[PDB]
Amino acid sequence: EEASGKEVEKVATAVLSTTARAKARAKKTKKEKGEFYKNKYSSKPYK
Amino acid sequence: TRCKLKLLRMERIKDHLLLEEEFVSNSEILKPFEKKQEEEKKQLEEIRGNPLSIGTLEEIIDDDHAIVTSPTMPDYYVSILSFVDKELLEPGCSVLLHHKTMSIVGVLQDDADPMVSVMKMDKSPTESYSDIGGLESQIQEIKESVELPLTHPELYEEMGIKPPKGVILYGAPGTGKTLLAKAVANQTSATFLRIVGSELIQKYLGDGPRLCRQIFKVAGENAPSIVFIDEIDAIGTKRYDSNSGGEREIQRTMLELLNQLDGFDDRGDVKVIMATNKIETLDPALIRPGRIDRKILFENPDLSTKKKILGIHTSKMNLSEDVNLETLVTTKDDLSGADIQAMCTEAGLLALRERRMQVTAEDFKQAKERVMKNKVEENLEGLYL
Amino acid sequence: MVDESDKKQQTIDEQSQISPEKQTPNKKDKKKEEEEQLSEEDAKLKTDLELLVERLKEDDSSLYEASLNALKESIKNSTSSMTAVPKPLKFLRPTYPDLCSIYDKWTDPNLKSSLADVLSILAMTYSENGKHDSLRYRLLSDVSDFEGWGHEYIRHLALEIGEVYNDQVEKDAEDETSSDGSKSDGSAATSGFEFSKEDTLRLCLDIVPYFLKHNGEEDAVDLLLEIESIDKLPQFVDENTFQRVCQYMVACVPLLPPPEDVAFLKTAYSIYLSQNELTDAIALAVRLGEEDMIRSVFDATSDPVMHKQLAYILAAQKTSFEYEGVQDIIGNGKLSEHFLYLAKELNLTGPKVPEDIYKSHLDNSKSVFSSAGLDSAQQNLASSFVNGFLNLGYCNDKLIVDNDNWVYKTKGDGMTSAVASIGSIYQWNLDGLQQLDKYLYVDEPEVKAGALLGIGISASGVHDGEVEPALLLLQDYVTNPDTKISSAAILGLGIAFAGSKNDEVLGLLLPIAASTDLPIETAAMASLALAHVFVGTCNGDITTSIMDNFLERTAIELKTDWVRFLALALGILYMGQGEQVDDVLETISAIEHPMTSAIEVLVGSCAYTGTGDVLLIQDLLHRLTPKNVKGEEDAEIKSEEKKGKSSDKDATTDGKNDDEEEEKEAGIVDELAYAVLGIALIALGEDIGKEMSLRHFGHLMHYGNEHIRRMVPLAMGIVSVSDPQMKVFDTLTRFSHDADLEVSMNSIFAMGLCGAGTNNARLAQLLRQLASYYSREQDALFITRLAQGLLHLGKGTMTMDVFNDAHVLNKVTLASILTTAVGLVSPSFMLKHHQLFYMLNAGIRPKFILALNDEGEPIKVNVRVGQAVETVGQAGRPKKITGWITQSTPVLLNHGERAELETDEY
């Protein structure tokens, strides 16, 4: 992704994570209330 | 009971909500700077930079120049450069200077100093009225002079007489003078500044009058107002070093208070209350008699006064209810309410020696005899002839 | 201890010195090991009951912990004894508290969780018998306090509550909800609940409204209705018991859904009706708005004695005080039916007498001549504004008013306002009609209109007297072809008739007179005026207004201002109901525009009132939503956006206002604390958002009716000099009125200093001068609180035109409207039969910080203040009635009520 693609991605999550909890919580509650590193390459053929 | 709970439930939906709103609103989509800030910011940095020397503003000359003093000893004929307008500045304020070239780059400090901290009190005092028991009449003299003109000047106008201004509280330790002042002020719900006199006098030269002038400015803005200057008696005619000095700096601070008392603005709507031993401790000079008007001589508690004051104290000592309020009064020798404070302390002191597990009727009675005995012992028999 | 020999009665004596520990092996080992031994336990039962109480007075933890170790099964839980049926039912009684000692005397979270199930099954089963009723009572009422019972009774009663709590915490409830493992219903349980309510009335205060609310049922209130009528007299004196009841009801309000909220009130009303004081009953009857309820309180007063006596005098007067006037109907009705004196009682129900007492107060206070007469440029306009507000209420100003010079030298919309503000000299007073009519019959169309606005305001206290009615005059003037004469004419129609719903008036104002097709803001006043007429009773939630709102808004939307006026009109109409306000919301939302979405946020704040648990969150989700989308993008078509925003801003502040005022006094402090931090959020998020919120913020104060009218407004106002807008000051001041020349000594001092300070605008100076002048009022002049007074929880009928005008940026046009500010509090006077408009004494408490008293009843020592004391705002507002000195007792209780006092003098 390199540095550019990362920076957008990261800020992008952060907005949505805060924004979900900031509204989802208040509505919902009252809705209701009322390895083989060493593993070489498998000996199987591959194309 | 129930009502308290209600307030807690409301807080737990208010603060939780608030925290989250802030994050989303200030930044994210909306943006915290939203372009305009970014512009101001770039300019501000240029003009500035660290370090920045805090200053004191002596006078403004309308011509975009000012006369400032810094930490360093010589003064500076400096230019005002942008930011704070001349109007929005007040002389006597602490101001922001840029260090390389000293120009007024703003203000944010506003007499950032512990003195300011101690003086300001925007709410009314902790003492509500005639919780204090006895000297009723006395406290209903301080109310005639202070309180009554702020609440209604109408009555004074109609008589054809200036409202009284000022009271001077004087007399004797033990009568809870200081307390009466707080009491009267609370009823008024006057903005009740309060200060210790010891702070206004210091060794360093010329800081004293700055501070003193400021008290008077803050009070007039927030009129109707009471200024309570506690321990005016401190300053007195104490003179640090009797070789020389104490006849320079000390004298200058006293002067300033008086020059502003009547002032260049009419502050008849600023009452003053001076708590003091006597005015003869000070070099007498309290200007305008009718401007300090009625003076209040505290008598010490008498027989009826100390009943009420007693009643508070005995409720703290466990099981002293057994001994009738009246008969406690009778059996002891006539003494001041202060000496009740000494007596009440004596009861607990004896309970501690005994390892009296719970305070009893027997302790409170024993307490009288030892307390009375202390006072007689301390007295010196010179023999009435 | 637990030994086999200690099942013997030789061991009573040896154990008992330290503490009986005999009882453990006798009801554990003997019982479990055989069912043939159950018959033998029966005789030994009575010794065991005696010993149980001694072990609570000799309570210690080691001899319950150490001994019991297998009780749990033996009782019923697993052994499942019941071979002799009757035998184990009686042996429930000692074992149930012993078990509770391993719940509590032994501390262990784990043991607490496990035994929750076991204790509740054992309590329930035996509460049907009412021999378990006998266990609780004997401990609660014993004279001598002890360690053992003192915590254990508390664990027993949490279970009761628990059971009804099961319906709320989970949807599953009953025995599925395994907090208690026991269903809340059943004859056995219903028998146990009912009993306990009697005990905790005497001893507790805060668990009575928790049980009611948690059940969720009006069935809980039906059980309480009956027990409370029995306990009113013997437990405590009536007056004291009534005061406790009233606190409990307001508590139930937050966290009850809208259809149910009102229904709890009707069951409550039944308790009150039975209890003696019919003073308390009427408050709820007004609140509901129901004709049935309002009727039953009256009928109850008048009829029980056929002699006129105090009863009839009382009945008429309680309805009389209220300036809505819907209440006047009931009295007029009873009076036409009766004929003790048709002349006297009909006036006394009528709103003629509230005018009459204002004339009387005036003589005491002396008439104030202070009114401005200034001319030239802007000061010409400023003088017209000051005239009205400074002399608000009935207050002779004959001399300045006779001066026609200043009136006629005014020009523009200002010329109309000059005559409108003379009307406000004679506010709520018959007298001063003559002056307005002088103007009306001469010169410019301007002062003609203005005369009409003035008539409207004066005739207000004749909302239901129908003496020289406005309706007769003002109709002819609608028909006049010029737009200015017409508009004025119909707004007077509104103000004159108040909330009193008169068919001839309602139908006069029912079509907007002028063509809807026209975009004019002179026919805005049709919707504004009609709204007022609707408030103060069950709203019809009329369909005509809704339908026509949509049509005019689509057809012409150029004047952004025009259509805002229409949206606020709906919001005002709906005040005092949220049941039917929900239904109409769907109609609004069905159709869509950003213009429609503006109306939507605003009516929702009104909707969700009757519970602040729901309301507040709604109008803070909302607050974000407009901002956020626009932010996203930024990172005549115009009108649509603008509206969207401006309403959103207003609705934020409104939902708080509707909560704190209607509901609990506790929230008054929570919303005040929340408000200031909420300005700051909005300031960071938008520069533009700040300015709109600031105005509504000073209105937060007046509408909510904060406790403190001294310190906190003054502090606020200093900050709001620096900020843009000074229309914030005008709303702020109506709260600031207080006991003048304390608050209002500061006010004049602040405004004039800052105008001097920086003349940033002449416009700014203007709003600064008018607001400080309005603040001060002389010789205890009548004041206006938005609160009904009588109903401290209440909301105004006609002080919601300030709400209309806060929203829209002030204009020269709008300043005429503001003269209207009718909702003046009446001076209190002692009565009985004399109907003397004077009082010996009345006590006040100078401070207010009470919120335990939702009543706002003060300590009765008080501080005595003379005759003709206008019922001052908050920090003075709680009022007790002085006359015991003369041997008189209030029969009409005051609790900072607006009401004129009445005693039965011995």
Ligand SMILES: Nc1ncnc2c1ncn2[C@@H]1O[C@H](COP(=O)(O)OP(=O)(O)NP(=O)(O)O)[C@@H](O)[C@H]1O
């Ligand atoms: N009417 C009164 N008001 C207040 N305190 C009183 C009164 N009468 C007697 N007292 C007693 O005086 C005590 C407090 O007095 P205190 O604060 O020592 O004095 P002061 O007169 O302000 N002196 P200083 O110690 O020089 O500042 C109270 O705790 C009472 O025991």
Ligand SMILES: [Mg+2]
């Ligand atoms: Mg002192």
